[PDB]
Every structure is written in C-alpha cells, then in structure tokens.
Design a protein around this nucleic acid. Structure first.
Length: 305
RNA sequence: CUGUGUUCGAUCCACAG
RNA sequence: CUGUGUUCGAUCCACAG
RNA sequence: CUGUGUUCGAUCCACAG
C-alpha cells in the first residue's frame, strides 16, 4: 500500500475529481484526493494525493502556479470561460500597444474579485451551484499577486501569455479584468497549468492513458515530498515515542537544518522514515542547553503507513 | 457532523470545530 | 507499582462521522 | 464538534495504599 504524491496531468474535458476517480480505479485505493482544482476547460498539472499522502495536500495550496492562457477579447460569458453561455461578443477596437500596456499593468499585486463560478462557499453552498441556479455572486476582492507575465503573443482579439501567480488567483478573473482595462471584456479560451510549485507538466502523468503499474511507480513517497521544507532527524530511539504523539524536545534529536520559528519541518527517523511534520517553537541555533526540551510542536504524525 | 478551503459539477479530498 | 479520580481529572496522537 | 483506541494508543495531574 503506497503513500504519497502523484503529479497527474489533466487533459481538457474531465473535472478534477474525474482524475481522482481514475486513480482510485486504477490503484484500487479508496483514499485519494487532489491538491488544487483545475477547471474542466483547462489542462495541466493537478496534484494527487494517495493514502497518507492526502494528508500533505494542504501544503500545495500555498505554492505558486504558472499558467499559459489564451483569451479572446470582446467576448464575455457567464463563467468567464469558453464553456459559458455567451453574454456579449463585441469587436474590441484596440491597438497591440494598449493591449500590451493593460496586460502589464496587472503585474505586481492587486485586488481580484473571484468568478461567480467558483468553489467558494456562501452560507454552506458552493458558488458554482448557486450560479447554475442563476444566483451570480460577487464576493469581496482578494489581495492577489501576479509575479510576472511573459511570452505574450497577439493577433486579432486572440491574446495569449504565461503568468506566474500567487495562491488564490483566478486566471479567468485576470482575463476579464485586463479586458475591462481595455474596456471591452475578455474571456479565457484555453488554459494550461504548466506548474504547481516545483512540479512541472513535463513530469506530469496522464492517468487516463496510463496503466495502473506506471501510475503506481509514479507516486512520490512521503520521505520525498515537501522537499522544500527543512529536514530534521531524531534518535532512532525516539521514533516510537513520536509515533505515539509525544511532542519533540531537545533531548530527542540529532541533526537539523536551521529553521525560523513557526516554520513547518519534517521529522525524520534517522533510518529514513518520515515520522511527522512539526512546527518550530524557536530558531534552530539555540544549542544553548546549559539546563532544561520543547522544540518542535507536532502538526501531523504518520501513524500506520 | 457542521463550517471553510482548493483556478467550477469534492456529497467523495484537506483543514478547523 | 496498586486504587480512586467525584457528572467519565488534564492533555497529545490516530481513526471514524 | 460527536465518538472510538489490548492498564491509554501516549503523556500528565490530584488523592490515597
């Protein structure tokens, strides 16, 4: 029984949960989830968590993503994408030059209003369910960050480019906003998530065409997940303790790799096994122990694996 | 269970209570 | 170590809903 | 939140033997 992360590739068409169902089917495993939804009209990297691996999916919410969109100027739909019923389809009269200005004025952070067709909740209900009911909601804007936009290609009302964004950013909203700047509206017609954090589309596995054995070999085990988080090893004797829920004290330790207080770090078994993820109670340099323990606070323990 | 989250058809995953 | 914790003493894990 | 966990799964505290 494997535990870990799978960098899946979702083709255009399937819902993100369809991908999860393909993995549950091929691996004959019930515990599967994803770490960030990709709309049905889009394709690209979709992080999949298997077994105990579902327990570290939360860590993918805070990573940066890189997107390659193509939008059509002068077109507006209800969903903000090509699958939505068209609400308006005018002829945007703008020059490559303004278009260029409007797209790069978004660079830097700004306050983005999420699409009515989204997974946000309003009084216990999904916003895309209320929208199908015809209740179009405009939630408060969220502080978003567009780190950079490159590979811009224009031709007609067809504009495309790549963009690295912060967590919580909707490309569909971005396209509509740029269109608003140009004052004519724009709608996303193709969207490709080329990366989520360190995981790229080049390493993604299309689970729909892969046989169960390769999907299986493709799973990244826990010990190799969240490699961007600082490591920490404990004495091969302290393992059973930790696995029992024992917090971590200076006593039970060994080697560490520096960590700013509050930092989430992964506790290793010095035999390699990942025992748990814990939070830093202080800065790791304070080897000052002329006396007294308490060091890392238990966040998640990987019992039974 | 209730709630929230994730780029929209997670009741299915996560997190909080 | 054994008993009791006065309405299942406190708390940490994990699993389930 | 509500339940579960071979002296508790693990650690404490208060009383007494």
């Amino acid at each position: 029984m494997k535990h870990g992360i799978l960098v899946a590739y979702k083709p255009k068409g399937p819902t993100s949960h369809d991908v999860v169902d393909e993995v549950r089917k091929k691996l004959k495993t019930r515990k599967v989830g994803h770490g960030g939804t990709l709309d049905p009209f889009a394709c690209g990297v979709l992080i999949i968590g298997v077994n105990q691996g579902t327990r570290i999916l939360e860590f993918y919410k805070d990573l940066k993503k890189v997107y390659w969109v193509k939008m059509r100027l002068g077109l507006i739909t209800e969903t903000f994408d090509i699958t939505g019923e068209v609400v308006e389809e005018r002829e945007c009269n703008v020059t490559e030059e303004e278009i260029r200005e409007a797209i790069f004025s978004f660079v830097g952070e700004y306050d983005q209003v999420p699409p009515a067709y989204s997974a946000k909740k309003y009084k216990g209900e999904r916003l895309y369910k209320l929208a199908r009911e015809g209740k179009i909601i405009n939630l408060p804007p969220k502080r978003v960050k567009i780190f950079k936009i490159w590979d811009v290609n224009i031709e007609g009302r067809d504009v495309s480019f790549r963009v690295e964004v912060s967590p919580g950013t909707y490309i569909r909203s971005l396209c509509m906003d740029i269109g608003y700047k140009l004052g004519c509206g724009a709608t996303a017609v193709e969207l490709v998530r080329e990366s989520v954090g360190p995981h790229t589309i080049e390493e993604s596995l299309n689970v729909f065409e892969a046989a169960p054995e390769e999907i299986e070999n493709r799973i990244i085990p826990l010990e190799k997940c969240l490699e961007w988080l600082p490591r920490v090893v404990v004495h091969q004797e302290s393992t059973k303790m930790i696995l029992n829920g024992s917090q971590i004290h200076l006593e039970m330790l060994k080697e560490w790799d520096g960590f700013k207080k509050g930092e989430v770090v992964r506790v290793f078994n010095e035999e390699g096994r990942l025992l748990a993820l814990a939070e830093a109670e202080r800065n790791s340099s304070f080897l000052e122990t002329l006396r007294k323990e308490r060091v890392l606070t238990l966040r998640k323990v990987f019992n039974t694996r």
